[PDB]
Design a protein around this ligand. Structure first.
Ligand SMILES: [Co+2]
Ligand SMILES: [Co+2]
Ligand SMILES: [Co+2]
Ligand SMILES: [Co+2]
Ligand SMILES: [Co+2]
Ligand SMILES: [Co+2]
Length: 76
């Protein structure tokens, strides 16, 4: 039962900060982190990680601690 973590666009956050957080928390390459950051900024949201419900719960928590707006939901 796959879940996803979604990050939502916040006016306040620096784009450079969002990119860094995605690299720090998920270990993503710089280009992919930027890709996701840009999707959040341009589309308003983006799926930033996927896996077990338990894994997504922690990803959400980590993101919240970093100051980003994160939610999770079961994948279709
Ligand atoms: Co913006
Ligand atoms: Co723009
Ligand atoms: Co749990
Ligand atoms: Co919270
Ligand atoms: Co809090
Ligand atoms: Co809070």
């Amino acid at each position: 039962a796959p879940w996803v973590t979604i990050v939502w666009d916040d006016p306040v956050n620096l784009m450079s900060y969002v990119t860094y957080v995605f690299q720090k928390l998920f270990g993503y390459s710089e280009p992919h982190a930027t890709k996701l950051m840009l999707q959040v900024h341009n589309e308003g949201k983006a799926v930033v990680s996927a896996g077990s419900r338990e894994s997504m719960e922690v990803d959400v928590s980590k993101l919240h601690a970093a100051g980003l707006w994160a939610t999770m939901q079961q994948d279709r």
